[PDB]
Design an enzyme around this catalytic site. Structure first.
Site, PDB file in Angstrom:
ATOM      1  CG  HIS A  80      -0.540   0.400   2.476  1.00 45.57           C
ATOM      2  ND1 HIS A  80      -0.208  -0.509   3.458  1.00 45.57           N
ATOM      3  CD2 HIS A  80      -0.360   1.626   3.022  1.00 45.57           C
ATOM      4  CE1 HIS A  80       0.186   0.140   4.540  1.00 45.57           C
ATOM      5  NE2 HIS A  80       0.096   1.437   4.304  1.00 45.57           N
ATOM      6  CG  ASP A  96       0.083  -3.944   2.822  1.00 46.29           C
ATOM      7  OD1 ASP A  96       0.589  -3.482   1.779  1.00 46.29           O
ATOM      8  OD2 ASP A  96      -0.282  -3.226   3.774  1.00 46.29           O
ATOM      9  N   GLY A 110       1.534   7.044   8.599  1.00 49.59           N
ATOM     10  CA  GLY A 110       2.916   7.436   8.318  1.00 49.59           C
ATOM     11  C   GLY A 110       3.938   6.402   8.754  1.00 49.59           C
ATOM     12  CB  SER A 143       2.263   3.000   5.896  1.00 46.15           C
ATOM     13  OG  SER A 143       0.909   3.131   6.251  1.00 46.15           O
ATOM     14  N   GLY A 144       4.484   0.526   6.241  1.00 52.14           N
ATOM     15  CA  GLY A 144       5.598  -0.081   5.530  1.00 52.14           C
ATOM     16  C   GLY A 144       6.817  -0.320   6.389  1.00 52.14           C
TER      17      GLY A 144
HETATM   18  C1  LIG Z   1      -0.006   2.542   9.141  1.00 57.63           C
HETATM   19  C2  LIG Z   1      -1.146   2.314  10.098  1.00 57.63           C
HETATM   20  C3  LIG Z   1      -0.906   1.530  11.210  1.00 57.63           C
HETATM   21  C4  LIG Z   1      -2.104   1.481  11.926  1.00 57.63           C
HETATM   22  C5  LIG Z   1      -2.361   0.748  13.221  1.00 57.63           C
HETATM   23  N1  LIG Z   1      -2.899   1.672  14.195  1.00 57.63           N
HETATM   24  N2  LIG Z   1      -3.035   2.212  11.259  1.00 57.63           N
HETATM   25  N3  LIG Z   1      -2.403   2.722  10.123  1.00 57.63           N
HETATM   26  C6  LIG Z   1      -3.219   3.566   9.214  1.00 57.63           C
END
Ligand SMILES: Cc1cc(CN)nn1C
Ligand SMILES: [Ca+2]
Length: 223
Positions: free
Chosen positions: A40, A84, A175, A177-178
């Protein structure tokens, strides 16, 4: 990261920031030429930033290297976020040192209760919005498959696990993420999804990296 702590500069040497004019995702350096992140996080025009602490200031240990190619997992479904995971190849090999270092892939999956380190430059608030400049860290346990599935009915696949705290207060967030979930020196997870951040009974959900080691190794070997 909500409810975490300031890691300390370059104390998480495998943590990368993906930059397309701005930080938009985390990633993990797995060898001199390759980064693993979330599918993502896919976009064009990615610059990989290694050796970062403050992402707004050049502090002297950074390496900025453009991506030559990205490989999203063949079975990634962006609706369910199943599979993912994505690989990013660097245009040139990073110079590895104490502050820019690869993280080992798992040889086996990690169990519920395993203590891990989650890190990133994501939002630090559970209600409002505040983005840190320096890297934040959270120590968090992997949760049981049963508790994970109970928290998110109909949504947890065999390629996902929950980590964090059912009481809330401590979690990954937008933020992050990844980015990495590292347990006993192995990359067991990738920051994938959740429902808000640090909310009661809504822990973070993470890509189960041990399921993808063969794909990662074979992909690297031919690309
Ligand atoms: C990247 C992310 C991690 C989480 C877990 N709270 N939610 N999001 C949007
Ligand atoms: Ca910097």
């Amino acid at each position: 990261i909500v409810g975490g702590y300031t890691c300390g500069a370059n104390t998480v040497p495998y943590q990368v920031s993906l930059n397309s004019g701005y930080h938009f995702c985390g990633g993990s350096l797995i060898n001199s030429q390759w980064v693993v992140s979330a599918a993502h996080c896919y976009k064009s025009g990615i610059q990989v930033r290694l050796g970062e602490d403050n992402i707004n200031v050049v502090e002297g240990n950074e390496q900025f290297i453009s991506a030559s190619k990205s490989i999203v997992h063949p079975s990634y479904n962006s609706n369910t976020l199943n599979n993912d995971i994505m690989l990013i190849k660097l245009k040139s090999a990073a110079s590895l040192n104490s502050r820019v270092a690869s993280i080992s892939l798992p040889t086996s999956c990690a169990s519920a209760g395993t203590q891990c380190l989650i890190s990133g430059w994501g939002n630090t608030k559970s209600s409002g919005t505040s983005y840190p400049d320096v890297l934040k860290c959270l120590k968090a346990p992997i949760l049981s498959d049963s508790s994970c599935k109970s928290a998110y009915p109909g949504q947890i696949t065999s390629n996902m696990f929950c980590a964090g705290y059912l009481e809330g207060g401590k979690d990954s967030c937008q933020g992050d993420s990844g980015g990495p979930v590292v347990c006993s020196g192995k990359l067991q997870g990738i920051v994938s999804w959740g429902s808000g951040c640090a909310q009661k009974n809504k822990p973070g959900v993470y890509t189960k990296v041990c399921n993808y080691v063969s794909w990662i190794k074979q992909t690297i070997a031919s690309n």
